Protein backbone atom coordinates (compact mmCIF):
# COMPACT_ATOMS: atom_id res chain seq x y z
CA UNK A 1 0.00 0.00 0.00
CA UNK A 2 0.91 3.50 -0.98
CA UNK A 3 -0.83 6.36 -1.45
CA UNK A 4 -2.61 7.46 -5.19
CA UNK A 5 -3.31 11.02 -5.48
CA UNK A 6 -6.99 12.09 -7.24
CA UNK A 7 -7.91 15.61 -6.83
CA UNK A 8 -11.39 15.17 -7.57
CA UNK A 9 -14.27 14.22 -5.94
CA UNK A 10 -15.38 16.76 -3.16
CA UNK A 11 -12.45 19.16 -3.33
CA UNK A 12 -13.07 21.92 -5.56
CA UNK A 13 -10.99 25.38 -5.18
CA UNK A 14 -7.81 25.82 -3.18
CA UNK A 15 -6.49 24.02 -0.36
CA UNK A 16 -7.16 25.78 2.64
CA UNK A 17 -5.98 23.55 5.48
CA UNK A 18 -4.56 19.98 4.92
CA UNK A 19 -6.09 18.09 8.29
CA UNK A 20 -9.35 19.56 6.89
CA UNK A 21 -9.51 18.75 3.42
CA UNK A 22 -8.17 15.19 4.30
CA UNK A 23 -10.55 14.84 6.87
CA UNK A 24 -13.23 15.74 4.05
CA UNK A 25 -11.80 13.38 1.30
CA UNK A 26 -11.68 11.03 3.26
CA UNK A 27 -15.36 11.40 4.82
CA UNK A 28 -17.29 12.07 1.43
CA UNK A 29 -14.90 10.21 -1.44
CA UNK A 30 -13.17 8.08 1.51
CA UNK A 31 -9.61 8.28 0.71
CA UNK A 32 -6.93 7.48 2.93
CA UNK A 33 -5.19 10.48 3.37
CA UNK A 34 -5.61 14.42 1.44
CA UNK A 35 -3.07 17.17 1.57
CA UNK A 36 -1.83 20.28 -0.29
CA UNK A 37 -0.45 18.82 -2.99
CA UNK A 38 1.70 21.84 -4.63
CA UNK A 39 0.32 21.25 -8.23
CA UNK A 40 1.43 24.28 -10.73
CA UNK A 41 0.69 27.03 -9.81
CA UNK A 42 -0.95 26.45 -6.59
CA UNK A 43 -1.45 24.08 -4.11
CA UNK A 44 -4.53 21.71 -3.68
CA UNK A 45 -6.15 19.77 -1.73
CA UNK A 46 -5.61 16.50 -3.96
CA UNK A 47 -7.08 13.49 -1.99
CA UNK A 48 -4.85 10.10 -1.37
CA UNK A 49 -6.30 6.94 -1.60
CA UNK A 50 -4.14 3.80 -1.01
CA UNK A 51 -2.84 2.03 -3.88
Known amino acids: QKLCQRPSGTWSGVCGNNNACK ?3 IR ?4 RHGSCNYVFPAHKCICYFPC
Open 23 to 25: NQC
Open 28 to 31: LEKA
